[PDB]
Amino acid sequence: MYGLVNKAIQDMISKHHGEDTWEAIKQKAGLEDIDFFVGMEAYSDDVTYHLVGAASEVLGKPAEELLIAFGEYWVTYTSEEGYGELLASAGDSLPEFMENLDNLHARVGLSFPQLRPPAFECQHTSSKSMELHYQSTRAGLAPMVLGLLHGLGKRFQTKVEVTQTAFRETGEDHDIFSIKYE
Amino acid sequence: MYGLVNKAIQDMISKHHGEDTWEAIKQKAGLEDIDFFVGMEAYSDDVTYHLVGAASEVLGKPAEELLIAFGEYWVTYTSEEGYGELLASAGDSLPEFMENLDNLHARVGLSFPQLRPPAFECQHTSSKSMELHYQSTRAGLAPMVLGLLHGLGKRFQTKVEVTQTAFRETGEDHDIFSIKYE
Ligand code: HEM
Numbered sequence: 001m002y003g004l005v006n007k008a009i010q011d012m013i014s015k016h017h018g019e020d021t022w023e024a025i026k027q028k029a030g031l032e033d034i035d036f037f038v039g040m041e042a043y044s045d046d047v048t049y050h051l052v053g054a055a056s057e058v059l060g061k062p063a064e065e066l067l068i069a070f071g072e073y074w075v076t077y078t079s080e081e082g083y084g085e086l087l088a089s090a091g092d093s094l095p096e097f098m099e100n101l102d103n104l105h106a107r108v109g110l111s112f113p114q115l116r117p118p119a120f121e122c123q124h125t126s127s128k129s130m131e132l133h134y135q136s137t138r139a140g141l142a143p144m145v146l147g148l149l150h151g152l153g154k155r156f157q158t159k160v161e162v163t164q165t166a167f168r169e170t171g172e173d174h175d176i177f178s179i180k181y182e
Numbered sequence: 183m184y185g186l187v188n189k190a191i192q193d194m195i196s197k198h199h200g201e202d203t204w205e206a207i208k209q210k211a212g213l214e215d216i217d218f219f220v221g222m223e224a225y226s227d228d229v230t231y232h233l234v235g236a237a238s239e240v241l242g243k244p245a246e247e248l249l250i251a252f253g254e255y256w257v258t259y260t261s262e263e264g265y266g267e268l269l270a271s272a273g274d275s276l277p278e279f280m281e282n283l284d285n286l287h288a289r290v291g292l293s294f295p296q297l298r299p300p301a302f303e304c305q306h307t308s309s310k311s312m313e314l315h316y317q318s319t320r321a322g323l324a325p326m327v328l329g330l331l332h333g334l335g336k337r338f339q340t341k342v343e344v345t346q347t348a349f350r351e352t353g354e355d356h357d358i359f360s361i362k363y364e
């Protein structure tokens with residue numbers, strides 16, 4: 001995944017637990033050499049898995065818990081590190097924002113040629129509820145999707161309830177989340 | 183499971199989709215003969231699974247979604263059909279409520295001698311997060327746990343974020359959920 005994602009993790013851990021903590025994770029993660037991550041360059045997905053892993057260990061939190069937190073953090077980080085306009089253009093409400101996500105990730109893909117974005121389909125079951133389908137070339141990130149949705153809820157001052165109803169990691173075709181929102 | 187659970191299910195479907203809908207489910211579920219469920223008497227778990235299975239068909243919702251909705255309904259239903267005091271004595275916050283949950287079910291067990299209550303262990307990873315272990319003599323109810331958790335969030339005016347990180351149904355030892363809450 002592009003360095004942006006890894007800068008963001010790093011940013012999150014450093015603001016929340018400081019540079020030493022970060023350095024520890026960095027060290028444990030096997031990446032002592034990387035001086036700084038390059039936003040617009042593509043790294044191996046491993047760099048991210050190891051980072052998450054190392055943070056799990058150093059912080060005594062399951063990885064999934066960290067993915068959730070990284071997920072809602074990402075909504076703030078992007079609004080402030082140069083994608084706020086792009087974010088805003090993608091919707092004025094959660095359900096609109098989710099319908100526009102594939103599009104958002106395509107506008108991003110222009111600037112980022114090796115992007116493997118996720119694919120998201122929304123099936124509205126009511127004007128306050130939807131069933132969100134997440135499809136991905138990667139495994140393990142469903143918990144991040146969940147944090148992102150909670151991030152978007154805070155952004156649009158909207159209360160949101162999210163429960164994952166189907167799982168890839170077992171052998172269901174893709175992750176589905178049932179969502180309820182004001 | 184004791185009749186209470188099945189009354190609550192009925193009560194939920196009747197209040198939300200009317201008696202004619204409930205009656206269709208009752209019929210399809212193969213239980214036309216049962217006039218009313220007896221709260222404090224024990225039924226076979228089948229009754230509940232057939233009940234759940236039927237509501238899925240009649241309503242055209244996956245079972246998992248119904249469980250999740252049943253799970254949050256239960257929190258209200260119990261507060262009003264005679265377990266409000268007991269509910270309230272069990273905590274003034276989510277993390278406290280979950281720590282006292284085994285005790286709650288033991289108190290209940292004094293009244294319901296054939297109860298097979300689930301067992302719930304909390305490992306607090308921070309003052310805003312935990313790793314929740316749910317152990318049960320039964321399979322398939324993890325989604326219900328997820329609704330119950332959202333139900334307790336509303337009760338204590340607390341945003342909660344839940345992802346299941348392990349699954350009985352695959353042959354992991356028990357269900358584990360990673361939880362973040364205000
Ligand atoms: C708003 C600005 C956003 C930007 C600039 C952005 C950009 C990106 C980038 C660069 C990646 C890495 C992909 C790769 O390296 O192959 C990515 C991945 C991802 N993005 Fe976003 N994104 C944004 C918003 C969102 C939101 C709001 C969500 C969810 C609601 C989302 C969901 C994801 C997911 C789930 C992935 C993981 C990739 C995967 O599943 O394989 N993104 N995004």
Ligand code: HEM
Binds near residue numbers: 266290318323327
């Ligand atoms: C006043 C509150 C409550 C009462 C009176 C109550 C009572 C019961 C009863 C009677 C059963 C049926 C078990 C059997 O028939 O053998 C049961 C099952 C269950 N209860 Fe509760 N309960 C309460 C609150 C909660 C809460 C708040 C949760 C939240 C997670 C919970 C989780 C469960 C679960 C998961 C089961 C399924 C049994 C299993 O997994 O084996 N209960 N409870």
